[PDB]
Amino acid sequence: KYTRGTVTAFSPFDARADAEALRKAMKGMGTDEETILKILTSRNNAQRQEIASAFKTLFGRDLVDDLKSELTGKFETLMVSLMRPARIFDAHALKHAIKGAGTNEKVLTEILASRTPAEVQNIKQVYMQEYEANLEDKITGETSGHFQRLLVVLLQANRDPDGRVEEALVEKDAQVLFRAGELKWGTDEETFITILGTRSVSHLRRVFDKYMTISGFQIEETIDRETSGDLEKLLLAVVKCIRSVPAYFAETLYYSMKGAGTDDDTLIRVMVSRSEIDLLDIRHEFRKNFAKSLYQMIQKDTSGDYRKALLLLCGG
Minimum CB distance to Ca ion smaller for 217 or for 255: 255
CA distance 71 to 50: 21
Q: How far is the CB of 184 from Ca ion (least distance, A)?
A: 29
Cβ proximity to Ca ion: between 12 and 102 the closer is 102
Measured distance CA(95)–CA(109) in Å, rounded: 14
Is residue 237 within 8 A of residue 113, CB to CB? The reply is yes
Is 151 buried (19+), middle (13-18) or exposed (0-12) by CB count in 10 A? buried
**In angstroms, what is the minimal distance from the CB of 115 to Ca ion?**
21
Q: With respect to Ca ion, which residue has the nearer C-beta, 66 or 173?
A: 66
What sign does the dihedral 114-120-122-123 (CA atoms) show?
positive
Shortest approach of Ca ion to residue 301 CB, angstroms?
A: 5
Contacts with Ca ion by CB under 5 A lie at 26, 31, 70, 103, 257, 262, 301
- Residue 160 beta carbon to Ca ion: minimum distance, rounded to whole angstroms: 33
Comparison of 264 and 281: residue with beta carbon closer to Ca ion: 264
Nearer to Ca ion, 94 or 235 (CB): 94
**Least distance in Å: CB of 227 to Ca ion?**
20
